[PDB]
Amino acid sequence: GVTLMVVSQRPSEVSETIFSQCSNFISLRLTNAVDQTYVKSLLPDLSAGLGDLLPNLAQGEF
């Protein structure tokens, strides 16, 4: 009976050993590219058709 909830805006600095356990994921606009690469290296259901919206996202969308 215990959970977690991580937050960050510079994930490239965070440890992967932990992100390798979360099940559901959320995301908003990402401009830098290093992140984008790190991210796309992890997520389980990222079709290429979705890997392009990340920098094109408006204000308030997710």
Ligand X SMILES: Nc1ncnc2c1ncn2[C@@H]1O[C@H](COP(=O)(O)OP(=O)(O)OP(=O)(O)O)[C@@H](O)[C@H]1O
- Check binding of 59 to ligand X (CB under 6 A): yes
29 token code pair? 């606009």
Contacting another protein within 9-38 (CB under 8 A)? 31-34
Torsion of CA 40, 41, 44, 48, to 10 degrees: 40
Nearer to ligand X, 45 or 61 (CB): 61
Nearer to another protein, 6 or 32 (CB): 32
Footprint on this chain of another protein (rule: CB under 8 A): 1, 3, 31-34, 41, 43-48, 52
